[model samples]
Target: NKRPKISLIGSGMIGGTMAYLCALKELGDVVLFDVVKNMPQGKALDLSHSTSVADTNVKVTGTNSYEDIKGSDVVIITAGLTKWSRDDLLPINAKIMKEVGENIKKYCPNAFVICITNPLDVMVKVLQEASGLPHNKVCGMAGVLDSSRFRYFIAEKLNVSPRDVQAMVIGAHGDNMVPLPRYVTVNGIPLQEFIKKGWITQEEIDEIVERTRNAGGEIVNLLGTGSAYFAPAASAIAMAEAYLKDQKRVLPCSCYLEGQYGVKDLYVGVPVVIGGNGVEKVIELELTPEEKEMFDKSIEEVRELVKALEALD
Candidate 1:
């Protein structure tokens, strides 16, 4: 009760793990909601047992009722169908997001919502529109996960620790996610220097970017049942931590654009400041010509998806 409350609206892999992570960190009180019988409650009790081991006093619980989410500080919407590599379930997920968003509006109108559903940028936009919340109050999960992959690849190529690598990846969450070498570095040293020194070639960088873009799909292809949950859940928790603690961290989260990156009225992942108020401020960094072109193409994909969602309405 004293601790701030954070709600995860899906008690599946990502949502359940996020609840566990938040409790471990003592980030705040954790709540999970799912339509499945005893799913959320079961997961919540399981994770609650870990709090003592984690040395955190935070409360963790779950319910099937949406009304339990009232007055939440932040609501994470991981409620949707899990997508396989070849799954074309966007339509179904879109409807899921719409209903979830409307419910969030009804139960926790003041809470910031994080959309983790696939085809996420469009779904986040749907949440914003449906909740009648400012674009800032609603965002999606992507940038941090994408950049984490990019940084991992760079560290392997450079034979350095991933923690020492810094990078920015923007654009769509899928195949077209833009990884910019110009904005990447290790200890403030540009990745281009590493490329020029034969440690990494231009094509190699592109290959890594491509891998980062398809990171989720590659995992889906490998697993055949579900996609990567650790990274997705970790990235979502990191965002939750930043917001819960009001750390004001800058990470690329899916944002509905209105002229940033030379694209208008589409939800694409971009670098933005995220904190207590959700999207605190969108820091629009300048992109090189090549990065700009690739980003613009990704924007086209998002725009099409947005249009499709609108048509459904």
Candidate 2:
């Protein structure tokens, strides 16, 4: 029986976690690639050993060479510097992604690309341009993770299960992101209804939004060394799994927008249906004037980052 193949670039915390989760799900055989000697090799060996307990026959390999990544159905790039400021990270990670993207073009041009690197909105555009892949097939793992953070905060505040809370996060992955509280719901009940029901006040809702906006920085401040990995890996894997299984899940992610939401030639987080064809369809939602204004601001931020990256080339 033929199985899908997943190639993960960078064998760091996020990459390793992704390999572990993918193997656990038997998503496919995995290839973990990293530049540092023995790091990826060691991770692949360690994860391979867990297959017996994991009860999955998925084979995992580690390598420093891109040749081994040929024919990957999905390539998740969790590589690059993590702790650097977005400005400092731009050129360094762009050069790194250029090489990775070129290799992907030569080896796996048809692969679906999920970029998890920092300055996500910008990095994804770099990869997309470098790989020459169709816009739909190349996206960043930001919105799903961001929305997950928002859902967790909301659920915790209301004493409800996260599974019962549905939220949508759009635009850039950073502070200026658009989190539509109007669209957020707990078991199909809008969040505003919660305020009306005396479950949460407007002040509490505002606080939750602020917290969600800074969730990544919160974890970074806590770690004092590394950024988040667990949720990030899970979020990317969710996108991969949706494609591998043709699940067609409507997920929020960074996708290239061409006049969608009045934005062009930029990758901003938006809702898209993930299936066997990668991003099967971009879902355009009618945003309130307030949400649209915030989204425009977020896109402008992305545009500035993209401009800096272009100057590098």
Candidate 3:
């Protein structure tokens, strides 16, 4: 009968930023969890102290135990190794996920869970299977970040404010992410309108789309290590806010598919209405044949990863 609680499993870059953002929005009290001795506690203390200055009353707590997260309304999984080889990364993350999933089931069984683990779609399926939560209750955070990248790149090319840009990137998160330039709009005007006016060309559009796909790597390369966080944390919290506040916003996310987009029994990026009910509705797009071909290719890669993961099981 009160404020909701959000738990972040891992006090890494993204988790700390999420707690900071959550407190800033006064979205809910936050619990930051990590296995490291006092890491989460230290970060949580620093964030909690900011509440006095920021005028937000949200509580920020840290713990090394899953029991502290018992009543979480939302749980974000950001706990996994990075920069490791695929052979080692998958199995190690596999082990970590099994424990994390079972703990979520034991502790906050009803929490709306968002998986931010790398190998995005595959780890999501693993968490889903391990926790045995309803398919709709668990999802991955990918499409929002991808689409946000698309919007920014498009706006940069056009020399316009990103606030006026509405772009969509669906399918997968990696090299094959599908960016639908046809669906882009600037202040409700179709991008094609800008193209028709000779302000931009098809050649430039292709370059912008390609840039969006590699934007993550673009950051990693620039940073010299580590991945992007400012974008990812904001994207994750938007989805969390939609659920906790029942905003019912239609944002792109990785949701499990049951015969939608010509794929079944796998999770992929698509637009979804996320609210208190969780992944309320998955929106199907009327993709062009070219778009469908690209999308199908992404799905095939996801299927390949899922199959390889099954061998691990």
- Which candidate achieves the best TM-score against the true structure? 2
Per-candidate clashes come to 0, 0, 0
Give the CA lDDT, 0 to 100, for residue 133 in model 2: 93
Superposing every Cα of model 1 onto the true structure, what RMSD results? 1.9
Cα RMSD, model 3: 1.6
Candidate with best lDDT: 2
Task: List model 2 lDDT by residue over 88-135, tens digit each.
Answer: 688889888888899999999989999988788889998998899998
TM-scores across all candidates? 0.94, 0.97, 0.96
Single out the weakest 10-residue window by summed lDDT for candidate 2: 81-90
Q: Give the TM-score of candidate 1.
A: 0.94
What is the lDDT of every predicted structure here? Answer: 0.83, 0.90, 0.89
Clashing residue pairs, backbone N/CA/C < 3 A, model 3: none
Which window of ten consecutive residues has the lowest lDDT sum in model 1?
81-90
Who is ahead in lDDT, 2 or 3?
2
lDDT of 3 by residue, 169-203 (tens): 89877777898989999999999999989878989
